[PDB]
Amino acid sequence: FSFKKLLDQCENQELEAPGGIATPPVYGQLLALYLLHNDMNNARYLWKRIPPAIKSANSELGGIWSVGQRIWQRDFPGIYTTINAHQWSETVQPIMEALRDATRRRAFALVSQAYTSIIADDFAAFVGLPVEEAVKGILEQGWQADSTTRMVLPRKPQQLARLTDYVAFLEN
């Protein structure tokens, strides 16, 4: 629930500024929050909104955009690869951990809905877990796995007041 206010407070801080340019630390917070909610349209325009002087001075903004670039092309293995490739500051560390976990639920829902049978090697890349781990995870959720083929088979497991409003409108 706390993620609702954090995104709004960073957006407002960018709107009003003492000199029209916001602080470097709040730029990374806004970019990370956009990626957490899968709002890639505003994140992409935020990258162009960052002045080149700020982007060149702070290398953190370049790194956070690398993670977003993977999400933009829907490169699931690259989302986990770039998240752990670099070390982030403490003010955006907890939300970026939530971004990595949020990507994990996105992969789980995508496989459960868009796949009737997915090979284990590709399925492990989607979730971001090692191949052996992904084998043990599915049975805990009831998903069937078959040996000698290494293939996973996922499957998805005031009316009265309103009505009198309709009549009153029609009868005037």
């Binding site: 009316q159 009198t164 309709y166 009153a168 409108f169 029609l170």
Partner: protein, 275 residues
């Protein structure tokens, strides 16, 4: 049934219309006399459509003008093959000696006459109780027969039910209110019945009334039957019906909006662009 008397709602409306017509014609309310017919099956009454039988009401005495009824007999026999004379009706309160005299006159025609006394001036909730008919009490000397009231039933056919429903409040006061008042009355009487049953159960629990082992068993069965159709198919059908009615409302809110928009553009074309 214990006395097997079954009145039809058409008779009550007939008597009411007769009384109202005579009251309007003569200015003041006036006593009326009628003739109830019906089907007799040994121990069954089954009153049906009644006719006028004006007769006479002269001064304080009722004269025997039953020759007019005799002429009306063959007339009503042409349209009612299986219907026969059963009794007569009146408008007033408690029975009177004049009613006794008219009943004595009527017993000349038929052996088992009834006596309906529909009261129009009543101001109390339950309906005036139809007929006070008697088996005629005989004592040594003068007969001095009285009337021994026995219960009545309001058995009605489907056509009568539909007609009565149409005359009753059904579809300034809006149609929503008229439709909802009928439901309010039905739910109110159901609630009164259930509340009185609950009061009897509480009285039996406390000890005011003797413990009847069968009434509480029936009450337990009634309580167990209370969740009517709670199936998943019933819910699916109910939601399908609700969605269908919602679509039928959308198609028609759209029509009303189109009509109002047409009126708006008609008024707009004669205000700005004068062509």
């Amino acid at each position: 049934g214990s006395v097997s008397v079954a009145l039809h709602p058409l008779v009550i409306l007939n008597i009411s219309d007769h009384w109202i017509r005579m009251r309007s014609q003569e200015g003041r309310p006036v006593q009326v006399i009628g003739a109830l017919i019906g089907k007799q099956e040994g121990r069954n009454i089954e009153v049906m459509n009644s006719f006028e039988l004006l007769s006479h009401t002269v001064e304080e005495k009722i004269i025997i003008d039953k020759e007019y009824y005799y002429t009306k007999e063959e007339q009503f026999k042409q349209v009612f093959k299986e219907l026969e004379f059963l009794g007569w009706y009146t408008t007033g309160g408690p029975p009177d000696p004049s009613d006794i005299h008219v009943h004595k006159q009527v017993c000349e025609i038929i052996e088992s006459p009834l006596f309906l006394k529909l009261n129009p001036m009543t101001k109390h909730t339950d309906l005036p109780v139809s007929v006070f008919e008697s088996v005629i009490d005989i004592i040594n000397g003068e007969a001095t027969m009285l009337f021994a009231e026995l219960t009545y039933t309001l058995a009605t056919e489907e056509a009568e039910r539909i007609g009565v429903d149409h005359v009753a409040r059904m579809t300034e006061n809006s149609t929503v209110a008229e439709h909802l008042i009928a439901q309010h009355s039905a739910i109110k009487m159901l609630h009164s019945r259930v509340k009185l049953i609950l009061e009897y159960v509480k009285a039996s629990e406390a000890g005011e009334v003797p413990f009847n082992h069968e009434i509480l068993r029936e009450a337990y069965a009634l309580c167990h039957c209370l969740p009517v159709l709670s199936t998943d198919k019933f819910k699916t059908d109910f939601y399908d019906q609700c969605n269908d009615v919602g679509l039928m409302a959308y198609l028609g809110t759209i029509t009303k909006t189109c009509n109002t928009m047409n009126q708006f553009v008609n008024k707009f074309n004669v205000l700005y662009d004068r062509q």
